[PDB]
Write a protein that binds this DNA or RNA. Structure first.
Ligand SMILES: [Mg+2]
Ligand SMILES: [Mg+2]
Ligand SMILES: [Mg+2]
Ligand SMILES: [Mg+2]
Ligand SMILES: [Mg+2]
Ligand SMILES: [Mg+2]
Ligand SMILES: [Mg+2]
Ligand SMILES: [Mg+2]
Ligand SMILES: [Mg+2]
Ligand SMILES: [Mg+2]
Ligand SMILES: [Mg+2]
Ligand SMILES: [Mg+2]
Ligand SMILES: [Mg+2]
Ligand SMILES: [Mg+2]
Ligand SMILES: [Mg+2]
Ligand SMILES: [Mg+2]
Ligand SMILES: [Mg+2]
Ligand SMILES: [Mg+2]
Ligand SMILES: [Mg+2]
Ligand SMILES: [Mg+2]
Ligand SMILES: [Mg+2]
Ligand SMILES: [Mg+2]
Ligand SMILES: [Mg+2]
Ligand SMILES: [Mg+2]
Ligand SMILES: [Mg+2]
Ligand SMILES: [Mg+2]
Ligand SMILES: [Mg+2]
Lengths: 60, 144, 185, 67
RNA sequence: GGACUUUUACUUUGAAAAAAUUAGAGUGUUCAAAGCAGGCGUAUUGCUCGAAUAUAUUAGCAUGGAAUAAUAGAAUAGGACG
RNA sequence: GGAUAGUGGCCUACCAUGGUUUCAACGGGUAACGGGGAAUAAGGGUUCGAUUCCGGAGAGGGAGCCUGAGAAACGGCUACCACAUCCAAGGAAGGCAGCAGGCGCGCAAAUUACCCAAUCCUAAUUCAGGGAGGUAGUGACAAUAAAUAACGAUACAGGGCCCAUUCGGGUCUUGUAAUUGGAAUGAGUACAAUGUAAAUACCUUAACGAGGAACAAUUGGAGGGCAAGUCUGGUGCCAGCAGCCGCGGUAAUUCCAGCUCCAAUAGCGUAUAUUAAAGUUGUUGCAGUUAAAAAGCUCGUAGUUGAACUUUGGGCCCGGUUGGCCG
């Protein structure tokens, strides 16, 4: 069907969303030590057990 | 025993029959006839480079409503005109008419992607510096 | 126009993509043996797979088949020599069994821990990879060396390095430079 | 460290049984170092396009300086 | 050495069988991919294991099998023997 | 007969009328050199091989030939066709599908470097020559190993546990730390020798070389399939996402982002193909009443197929390999 519609609005949403810049953070380990932080975090010390186990909850 | 011959000599009838009924096997057909080279905008190659003609905004299909930004591209090696899509938000701003772009397929063996009727190819590299890099802000568009 | 320096890869790769059970199991194995790549687990799983296969193959043969006997007991003595196959269960029937942890538990960075010298599989990793420890005076820096059995009796520290006496190093003696330049002349 | 070594019965029996790059490395025969490979090649290829001793053509191309 | 022999299919076993690849043995290239090395003593005059095995299917060959499948024979006896 | 090195319709005279074919001749296509092989792992299969080894064919296209033991050779010649260079306009010369290297073409591919030291070759030949071949440069082609951190003290919190009448923090540490602790090491830098034809790097090794401004990991994903949020801000059927099902028209679990998190990790994504999935090519092993699919019917040639029956049974000997209970 129509092929010649408007084009002006091209790149609208990105170009109008407030550029909020990142926040400086602790350098996470790069490699085995990361797999270790993952091991202890996932399993060793454990976290919540509210029914089951949540891997990324916000205001839960 | 319905159908196929079972004798110890029927080898011929069997392999022949296999050829025959292989011809209904789509993929086989296309691979054999060589639709690959005769038809198809690209040579059979993964991608192909062409030149930008019109900048078209195609109204998407149903049940959907939008304006899919695209580019009329005439393949260099081919001269075949073919209309492709410029992915990501923005990007149509990056391309401009009379430009030299690298085109790739839309992963479906031909067949237009989603709500975009006709368009069977997406864009990858304007003026030789990759859409993504620009749309982020790594590289910057070449001089001319 | 020369000769083709041949090669082959060492790791297979799991056919299912995102299975939490397997992924967690893998993770635990990594976090326990001090691994960085799931590839370190894959590699082993593949070794295990080719062995197990050779086993099945030789079993389908006839009992006391020449090939079965020769090759079978060759694989077997190969497997016991590095402390993987149980000297008790020792007629391929158990290599059909076996598992990954058998191989895992026999690596250099594992042995370096299972007998002191570590208190941490990670301490094992770091130390080993840092030119410490050896077999003879032959330094080794491969976290997966796989300690051969009757050489377990040679995993000390290095004739180089501290912990085995040779020189404190460069950081320590830089502190000695700090002392010999501070508290006096 | 691990390498290889040999010992020749006289001093004359090494200077004629050894690669003279080894004699070079030791301190026996100095390297008569020369024009590059491409250079020498090029010189032979020039020299090919001349039949005879040369002086005849140097002087016949010296007669060429006249007319 | 002389004299004649119904033709097959299948199967068995062997010969003829480039290397690399492959499968697989051996040797701790620091490990691994690899490489085909190496190992030892009297390390001032020298001792020594190696560098396998497998596959190589159709056809040609050579050998054993005689089930399963065909083929040929003696009725206008122009049969079989001696 | 002729010709060849030689057999032969190889060629020529005369004579005959034969030769292949549905068991697929002949013709057409091949984005076709053949093989050893390669990719995919239940098996059977499917797919691919221009490319390090073997065999063949060419040296821009055709033919022609000299020399020679060997060539219908092309870094040999001759002619023609197509290219194309030099000129003083009379004339003369070139053949990179050798090594580099240049244009072109493209999605797509590296230095106009060093050497005979090795592996081997040729000559008259121990030496000379060898862009064969080797060295380095270029090089996330594919492949192997695998740094980006290890360990204390300590500020409360704790779960363990002896006791609990009721102070609890004690010594077994799970560790979350917004204070600290001395330790270690190659990534790089760089004497030395080693390496090498010479150099380069590697293995070795003096003097250097880690505290968050690093010597600072990436590439995608977080509705589903599918592993990880129903957090906050933006947009409002717009911009965009989405392989597929689907999301966006003001509280978007999908878009633009921030935070957090997942998967893989010096690698991850995308496009094209192909294999597995695929018992959706079905010999193994598909389906066909109504979903795709039994010719309206019977004859019948090739083809595949085709009942049963002919030395069955009894008796004796020899000599091998495992295994039993003795050793
Ligand atoms: Mg049809
Ligand atoms: Mg739909
Ligand atoms: Mg064209
Ligand atoms: Mg050191
Ligand atoms: Mg071709
Ligand atoms: Mg082919
Ligand atoms: Mg080939
Ligand atoms: Mg080609
Ligand atoms: Mg020629
Ligand atoms: Mg040439
Ligand atoms: Mg030639
Ligand atoms: Mg003139
Ligand atoms: Mg060239
Ligand atoms: Mg490339
Ligand atoms: Mg020479
Ligand atoms: Mg480089
Ligand atoms: Mg870094
Ligand atoms: Mg990210
Ligand atoms: Mg989920
Ligand atoms: Mg929101
Ligand atoms: Mg988001
Ligand atoms: Mg079906
Ligand atoms: Mg129907
Ligand atoms: Mg019917
Ligand atoms: Mg009919
Ligand atoms: Mg029958
Ligand atoms: Mg009998």
């Amino acid at each position: 069907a129509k092929v010649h519609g408007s084009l002006a609005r091209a790149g609208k949403v990105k170009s109008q969303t407030p550029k909020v810049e990142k926040t400086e953070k602790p350098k996470k380990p790069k490699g085995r030590a990361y797999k270790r932080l993952l091991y202890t975090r996932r399993f060793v010390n454990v976290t919540l057990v509210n029914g089951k186990r949540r891997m990324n909850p916000g205001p839960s | 025993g319905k159908g196929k011959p079972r004798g110890l000599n029927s080898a011929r009838k069997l392999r022949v029959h296999r050829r025959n009924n292989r011809w209904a096997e789509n993929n086989y057909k296309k691979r054999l006839l060589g639709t690959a080279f005769k038809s198809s905008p690209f040579g059979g190659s993964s991608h192909a480079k062409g030149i930008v003609l019109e900048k078209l905004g195609i109204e998407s299909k149903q049940p959907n409503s939008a304006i899919r930004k695209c580019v009329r591209v005439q393949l260099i090696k081919n001269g075949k005109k073919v209309t492709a899509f410029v992915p990501n938000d923005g990007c149509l701003n990056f391309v401009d008419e009379n430009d030299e772009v690298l085109l790739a397929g839309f992963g479906r063996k031909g067949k237009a992607k989603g709500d975009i009727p006709g368009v069977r190819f997406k864009v990858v590299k304007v003026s030789g510096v990759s859409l993504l890099a620009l749309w982020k802000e790594k590289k910057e568009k070449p001089r001319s | 126009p020369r000769a083709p320096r041949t090669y082959s890869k060492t790791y297979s790769t799991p056919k299912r993509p995102y299975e939490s059970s397997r992924l967690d199991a893998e993770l635990k194995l990594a976090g326990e043996f001090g691994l960085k790549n799931k590839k370190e687990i894959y590699r082993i799983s593949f070794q295990l797979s080719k062995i197990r296969r050779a086993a099945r193959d030789l079993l389908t043969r006839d009992e006391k088949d020449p090939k079965r006997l020769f090759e079978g007991n060759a694989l077997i003595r190969r497997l016991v020599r590095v402390g993987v196959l149980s000297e008790d269960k020792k007629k391929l029937d158990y290599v059909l069994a076996l598992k990954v942890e058998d191989f895992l538990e026999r690596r250099l960075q594992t042995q370096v821990y299972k007998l002191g010298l570590a208190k941490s599989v990670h301490h094992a990793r770091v130390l080993i990879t840092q030119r410490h420890i050896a077999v003879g005076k032959q330094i080794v820096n491969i976290p997966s060396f796989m300690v051969r059995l009757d050489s377990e009796k040679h995993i000390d520290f290095a004739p180089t390095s501290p912990f085995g006496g040779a020189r404190p190093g460069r950081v320590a003696r830089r502190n000695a430079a700090r002392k010999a330049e501070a508290s006096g002349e | 460290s691990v390498g290889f070594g040999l010992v020749y019965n006289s001093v004359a029996e090494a200077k004629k049984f050894e690669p003279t790059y080894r004699l070079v490395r030791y301190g026996l025969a100095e390297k008569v170092e020369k024009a590059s490979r491409q250079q020498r090649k090029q010189k032979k290829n020039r020299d090919k396009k001349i039949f005879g001793t040369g002086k005849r053509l140097a002087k016949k191309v010296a007669r060429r300086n006249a007319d």
